[PDB]
Amino acid sequence: LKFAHLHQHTQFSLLDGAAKLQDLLKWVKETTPEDPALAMTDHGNLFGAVEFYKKATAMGVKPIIGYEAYVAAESRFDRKRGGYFHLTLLAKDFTGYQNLVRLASRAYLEGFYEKPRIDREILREHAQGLIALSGCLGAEIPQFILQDRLDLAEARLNEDLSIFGDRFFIEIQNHGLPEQKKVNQVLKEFARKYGLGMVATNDGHYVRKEDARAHEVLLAIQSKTTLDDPERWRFPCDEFYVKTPEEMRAMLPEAEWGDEPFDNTVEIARMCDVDLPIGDKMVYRIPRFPLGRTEAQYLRELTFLGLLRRYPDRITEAFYREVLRLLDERALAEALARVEEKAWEELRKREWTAEAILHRALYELSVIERMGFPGYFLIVQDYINWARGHGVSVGPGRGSAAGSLVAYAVGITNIDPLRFGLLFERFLNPERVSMPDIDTDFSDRERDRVIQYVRERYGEDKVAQIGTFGSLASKAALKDVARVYGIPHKKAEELAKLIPVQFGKPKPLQEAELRAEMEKDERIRQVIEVAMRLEGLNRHASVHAAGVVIAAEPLTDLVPLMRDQEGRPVTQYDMGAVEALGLLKMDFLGLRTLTFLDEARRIVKESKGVELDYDRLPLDDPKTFELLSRGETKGVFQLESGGMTATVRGLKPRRLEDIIALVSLYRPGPMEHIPTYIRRHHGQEPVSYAEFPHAEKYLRPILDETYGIPVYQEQIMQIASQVAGYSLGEADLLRRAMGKKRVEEMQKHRERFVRGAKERGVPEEEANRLFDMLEAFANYGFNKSHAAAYSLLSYQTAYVKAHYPVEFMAALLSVERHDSDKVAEYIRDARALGIPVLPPDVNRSGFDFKVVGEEILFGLSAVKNVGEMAARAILEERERGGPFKSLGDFLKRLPEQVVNKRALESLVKAGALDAFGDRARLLASLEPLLRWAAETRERGRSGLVGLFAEVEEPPLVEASPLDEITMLRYEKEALGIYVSGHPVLRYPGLREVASCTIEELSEFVRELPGKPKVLLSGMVEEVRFTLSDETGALEVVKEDIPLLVLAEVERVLAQAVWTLEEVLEAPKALEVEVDHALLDEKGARLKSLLDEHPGSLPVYLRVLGPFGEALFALREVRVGEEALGLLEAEGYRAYLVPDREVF
Ligand SMILES: [Cl-]
Ligand SMILES: [Cl-]
Ligand SMILES: [Mg+2]
Ligand SMILES: [Mg+2]
Ligand SMILES: [Zn+2]
Ligand SMILES: [Zn+2]
């Protein structure tokens, strides 16, 4: 007696599936050793399919790809408020597989209501190659039976028989349930009346019977409730696990069911022959590129045309003519492309020169062509060159891509690969047929447009973004489970901090030595075991920020699809699964820096007429490196970390190569090589190769650029290629083998190395130890192509900041204009840098942030209630008529139709109309002048010339000037942020008591005790209230009311609060403010001054130190108030501040 589960749910039924793919497959294997089979039938998706197939296939289990469809009562287009039912589907052959793929796709793309649903219509369309089973209690037929509508159930049975023929089976499952008794009894009748054959399943959701509770809390994590609710999501019993053929019999007795339901199980599983194109199989699906041009000829064409643009001084028309005579501009390239490979190798046998460039380009093209990848390159070059001609910024390159001269020639890549030491062989290894990966950075604003270009260009049914599936982190798993079990957040957080973090992410609960915490409480015994039972599980299905597939044939033929919440078409398979089916996968990355460099160029142009051509800038500009050397890395790509900033100031880089090496080495591990780099860079330590005297002739040319240190992987490859005589491609393989650290296969390369090492130069004593140096530095060796390409963006960023500091800042503002916190921050950066940031102004402002002379000026679009049509209207009216002469002139030129009263109000409050006088006066003047303006047109559209049609605008309706609080209040309402001032700076009473400023918090607190308490004072901005200084804001647990706050810091948690009037009531203390410049004979000058006026006010001292501002409260001395006047009667500044003690 055997049995094969055909209705089993995995971790891929994301809401209720608890069976991990691995331990499920071993449990099936350990139960049934003979011809084991398992069907993956997940709730309305095909996510697991590929990984399930490849895990089961390598375990000797026969996988069966299945689908528990949600089937709509009527049509999949229904958005009816019947519902939807279940249906078990299995693919018996590959056409079956494909049809599942289409159905699963269509369920999401056409039929998604609450769940992804399909039709009996579309089922009928895609029924070929499918076995169907009557389904669980939630399915149509059993459901009808429960409702006493036997007529509908038989009618539906007929409908399905008309669809699937003899591939329809009556599905019979039994848990203790009383509904199952009634359903199965009637199902049994149907099965015998139509001669249908019953198949036993039991709808698994966990692996073993013990997993029932683990699964029950899983549901409580989706249901987001306590273990005791009730009404919390629960299954009807604890039976939904992978049962032994014996346990199955206990539910389905022999003297009542017979052998048929069991025998049919094994028979179906046998007749389910589905194979995926993986590993042994796998075809490369390269999409076709339209072009009397070969795919290989045109890539050649574009390369020759490219070099001429790329190396103007050394690759010219004259040069090409010579090469052809050694056997229009475009006509020569077109000709050179045809030259065959038998012809080419008859010229070589007869510093980067013209001839050198040809050879490298010709070599790369040779390798590309032979491997069958010219089509791949064409596709990539096409969409990148589109994006350029279409106002979409493109990075100089990423990853190994920039190592190819071809890539660089045809504009895939934008850094000179042979100027820097970049290697083609690191990108494509000539000695291994493997598809290259070309990732590309775009402006993060425009990236989607590039994807859209591809979608249109290659076909809507052939292009989708790749899906991603977050794993459940060990820490997060513990917290989620602990919630459910009714455990207080805090003691749970202490349990989560026990788990080690070895590389960014926490360690599996499998390993995790303070486990004696389980021994104490039996509650936590479960929590910990349950959390490791739920560890491997999945969250939901996001889009990959970068993944894109261009398939050769319609996607739905091999890979199922989805559509995310923003309408993006998404793959149901992940990164790897897609790639393991041999599909062309690209990365289109959104990059901030690119988007920033665009606004910079735009603003620069408008500011001073300069056309910033980033790809034509000199790379040896002094003022750029001097700025990096000063450590002014504030907005500079790649090097903004606290530590990194310090390192750049230390290094004082002078050429781009310093940036490349600095970025490569600054990370845990190589970090240590930087001091050495610096002393050698400063010209205060010789660079010596004495340990390899015979290898020096090879080592110097490679490692000189980087002061003897092997920093780059490319540097190693070259060393091994020159010393050992290795092919540069083989040196690549070597670096892979250094990285794998294969037990003793490393000793094979050793002997091979020394062989070629002797044969070349080194006496082999050096060789063995030189290989020791390689294996040492190959652990932390960096990919130079990636480093170099990125470094260029850093430079470009810094260069702008060096030469155009104001526009730089205005671009930083522009780029993050929708973030009130960042905008506030950037303003305070600019203001404390010499650059004034001004409120908008109807006469000078452009639409966005603008630089006038040497100031940054807010745009009109920045004003809160003003539409976008209105902002442009104002500007366009100002361009056809002159600058606005007065408020009246403004109101008659722009009717209320366009700039409504609400809009006008904000515009005043912003300061956009400040050129017309007092604001309070302007606000009041509005409605009278609106009446006036409306009345002018009445006379105007009733004849009346110009004197008869205008009793020219009355004076400004008078009112008292606004106070600072109310004026600043209006600004914020109108601009989101305060410009020129902050409400808190009006009453410095709070400033003085505050133990800190918002900015200084992190810096001040870190070094103190464990989880300290602190007092902060600022403004309130929430109906989790937000507190704000003139220095920043904070989350802390109504508006325009100042508060002092006592709170705990780890995030900030409030414990006590006092109002402005409360603080100004608590007894006051004298605070003197002393500079660092104070004599010995003062600290007893000041000391005696206070000694002579006793009382009971504590004395505080603000000591503005060299780095930081200390707060020394005095000692014994207690002044008696009068001392303030007599103390300000000398070179000392003083204040009567509220006493810090009370709070
Ligand atoms: Cl060395
Ligand atoms: Cl060294
Ligand atoms: Mg049906
Ligand atoms: Mg990629
Ligand atoms: Zn389920
Ligand atoms: Zn099910």
UniProtKB/Swiss-Prot annotation:
Subcellular location: Cytoplasm
GO cellular component entries: cytoplasm
Cross-referenced InterPro entries: DNA_pol3_alpha_NTPase_dom (IPR011708), DNA_pol3_alpha_thumb_dom (IPR041931), DNA_pol3_finger (IPR040982), DnaE2/DnaE/PolC (IPR004805), DNAPol_HHH (IPR029460), PHP_dom (IPR004013), Pol/His_phosphatase_N (IPR003141), Pol/histidinol_Pase-like (IPR016195)
EC identifiers of the protein: 2.7.7.7
Biological process according to GO: DNA replication
Record note on quaternary structure: DNA polymerase III contains a core (composed of alpha, epsilon and theta chains) that associates with a tau subunit. This core dimerizes to form the PolIII' complex. PolIII' associates with the gamma complex (composed of gamma, delta, delta', psi and chi chains) and with the beta chain to form the complete DNA polymerase III complex.
Record's catalysed reaction(s): DNA(n) + a 2'-deoxyribonucleoside 5'-triphosphate = DNA(n+1) + diphosphate
Annotated GO MF terms: 3'-5' exonuclease activity; DNA-directed DNA polymerase activity
Keywords: Cytoplasm, DNA replication, DNA-directed DNA polymerase, Nucleotidyltransferase, Transferase
Top-level taxon in the UniProt lineage: Bacteria
Main location: cytoplasm
Function statement: DNA polymerase III is a complex, multichain enzyme responsible for most of the replicative synthesis in bacteria. This DNA polymerase also exhibits 3' to 5' exonuclease activity. The alpha chain is the DNA polymerase.
Protein family per UniProt: Belongs to the DNA polymerase type-C family. DnaE subfamily.
Protein name: DNA polymerase III subunit alpha
CDD domains, per database record: DnaE_OBF, PHP_PolIIIA_DnaE3
